[PDB]
Amino acid sequence: MDDVVKFIHEVGSLKLTPRSGWLKLGIRLPESVAEHSFRAAIIAFILALKSGESVEKACKAATAALFHDLHEAREEQLSWMESKPDFSDVEVYVSDADKLELAFQGVEYSQQVSYAIRFAENVELKTDAAKEIYRVLMERKNPVWW
Amino acid sequence: MDDVVKFIHEVGSLKLTPRSGWLKLGIRLPESVAEHSFRAAIIAFILALKSGESVEKACKAATAALFHDLHEAREEQLSWMESKPDFSDVEVYVSDADKLELAFQGVEYSQQVSYAIRFAENVELKTDAAKEIYRVLMERKNPVWW
Incomplete structure (x- = not known):
C-alpha cells in the first residue's frame, strides 16, 4: 500500500501544477492541471452520453480523462497496477473533451x-457531439450561468 | 444543447470555489472544490479496485465522486438529463474517497x-480498503513523492 499512498500524494501535485499556457497572457492564478482534468472528465461523460454510449461507458470516458494528464506531475507512475486499464475505446471522447474544456x-x-478567446478558436474536434457543444459555446460566448 | 453549455460553464465555477475549511487556518490559496473532487475521484477508483470491483465499476465510482460536489456551485442542476444515472452501489467508495482526499x-x-493535521485525524472510514490506505498515510506522514 506504500506505492499507492505515494501515487495519491503524487496526484495531489496536479493541484499545484498551473495550466501554463495562460501565464504568458498575464493570468496570474490560472486553473491547475487537476482543475482542467476535473471538468474535462465531466465533459467526456457528456460527450459519450450524447454519442449514444451507456452510462457505464460514459463513466469510463470520464475516468480516462482523469488519468490522461497524470503524467504532467513528472507507464511508470502506474507501476502499482500490474494491469493496465483498457481505455482505448473512449480515447476519442477524452481527446475531444480536453479540447472543449480548453475552449x-x-x-x-x-x-x-x-486574447484568451484565441485558445477557443480554430479548435479541431472529431465527434459530432463535440462539434455541437462547441457551436453553441461559441454562439453564446456567455460564461454567466447563474 | 444550450442548457448543457450552461452546465459546463457552471461546472467551471468549482475551479473558483475554495475548499473553505482551510481558510481559517490561514492557508490563503487553498485547493478548490474541483481539485478536491479530481483527486477524490481517482481515490474512489483505487478504493473500488482494491475492494474487488471491476475496472468498469471502479470508473463508475470515479464518476460518482466527480458528480458528488457539483451542487456546491450553488437535482435541478442536472435537469438536462431526463435520467438520472444510478450511482447507489458506488456511494460507499465516494464517501470514503472524499474523507481520504481530505486526510x-x-x-x-x-x-x-x-494544525492542518487535525483534518486527517479521527477520520471514520467504512471500507477495509480505505482503512488500509489511511493507516499507511498516517504511518508515513510523508507527502514527498518525488
Whole structure:
C-alpha cells in the first residue's frame, strides 16, 4: 500500500501544477492541471452520453480523462497496477473533451483578457457531439450561468 | 444543447470555489472544490479496485465522486438529463474517497500549518480498503513523492 499512498500524494501535485499556457497572457492564478482534468472528465461523460454510449461507458470516458494528464506531475507512475486499464475505446471522447474544456476556459478568461478567446478558436474536434457543444459555446460566448 | 453549455460553464465555477475549511487556518490559496473532487475521484477508483470491483465499476465510482460536489456551485442542476444515472452501489467508495482526499490534503498542508493535521485525524472510514490506505498515510506522514 506504500506505492499507492505515494501515487495519491503524487496526484495531489496536479493541484499545484498551473495550466501554463495562460501565464504568458498575464493570468496570474490560472486553473491547475487537476482543475482542467476535473471538468474535462465531466465533459467526456457528456460527450459519450450524447454519442449514444451507456452510462457505464460514459463513466469510463470520464475516468480516462482523469488519468490522461497524470503524467504532467513528472507507464511508470502506474507501476502499482500490474494491469493496465483498457481505455482505448473512449480515447476519442477524452481527446475531444480536453479540447472543449480548453475552449470553455478560453471563453471564460476572455472576460479578463480578450486574447484568451484565441485558445477557443480554430479548435479541431472529431465527434459530432463535440462539434455541437462547441457551436453553441461559441454562439453564446456567455460564461454567466447563474 | 444550450442548457448543457450552461452546465459546463457552471461546472467551471468549482475551479473558483475554495475548499473553505482551510481558510481559517490561514492557508490563503487553498485547493478548490474541483481539485478536491479530481483527486477524490481517482481515490474512489483505487478504493473500488482494491475492494474487488471491476475496472468498469471502479470508473463508475470515479464518476460518482466527480458528480458528488457539483451542487456546491450553488437535482435541478442536472435537469438536462431526463435520467438520472444510478450511482447507489458506488456511494460507499465516494464517501470514503472524499474523507481520504481530505486526510491526504491535511497531511500535505501540515508542512505549512501544523494544525492542518487535525483534518486527517479521527477520520471514520467504512471500507477495509480505505482503512488500509489511511493507516499507511498516517504511518508515513510523508507527502514527498518525488
